[PDB]
């Protein structure tokens, strides 16, 4: 009846993620279910604990991202997939673009991530 | 190597080997319920998809990889996720980023869910 629901649910993850990520990593865990899979530069992570954890150990202090572009999708099996492509600026390291994966899924009645991917835009040289 | 990046990158190198040489085949990954997304836009259905992709105004697209992530997913997925440059005819080298949602249907993996967005110099 107007803006899809996976178009909200996927905004809605997306605003929920990043704050999150600049303001307390170690409360990810609740947005992941155990069976969770995580790529970080190349690197994979399975299951909640070594995602949050994983996610706590960036050395970085202040972080602040700008959503260029986000785009969500149902999946056959009734899961929401999204892509987003923007930029952050990680303390005072330059700013650079990233592009990130989410693939929410319904469990409990409440939208949850299974796969998130993320990579950092590198510059070319 | 693990096996869902044998099958996702087996999957790339088909789906961009199509694109650069023969659009009006790249059909063969899809099925008739996917769905696109390019730039922006919304291309529903194979049929939509492949019109869309067909008829880009240009000869030759070439595509190189940057880096290629691929990953499986409780229920039998893989998602494959893309960053590198592209070339059309002699316009200038552009960025790209692009997503794969891929499923087994009917003995085979095909793409259900494919996202592709430009990347802004």
New interface residues.
């Given amino acids: 009846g107007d803006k899809p629901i996976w178009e909200q649910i996927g905004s809605s993850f997306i605003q929920h993620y990043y704050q999150l990520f600049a303001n307390d990593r170690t409360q990810l865990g609740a947005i992941y279910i155990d069976?969770s899979?995580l790529?970080w530069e190349?690197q994979?992570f399975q299951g909640k604990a070594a995602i949050v954890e994983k996610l706590s150990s960036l050395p970085f202090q202040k972080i602040q991202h700008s959503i260029?572009?986000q785009?969500h999708?149902?999946?056959?099996?009734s899961?929401i997939?999204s892509?987003v492509?923007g930029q952050l600026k990680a303390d005072e390291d330059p700013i650079m673009?990233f592009?990130q994966?989410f693939?929410l899924?319904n469990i409990n009645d409440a939208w949850v991530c299974?796969?998130d991917?993320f990579?950092l835009?590198?510059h070319n040289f």
Avoid: E, F, W, Y
């Avoid at 999708?73 to 099996?77: A, C, F, I, L, W």
């Fill in positions: 069976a899979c790529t190349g994979q260029t572009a785009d999708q149902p999946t056959p099996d899961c997939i892509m492509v673009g592009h994966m693939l899924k299974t796969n991917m990579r835009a590198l």
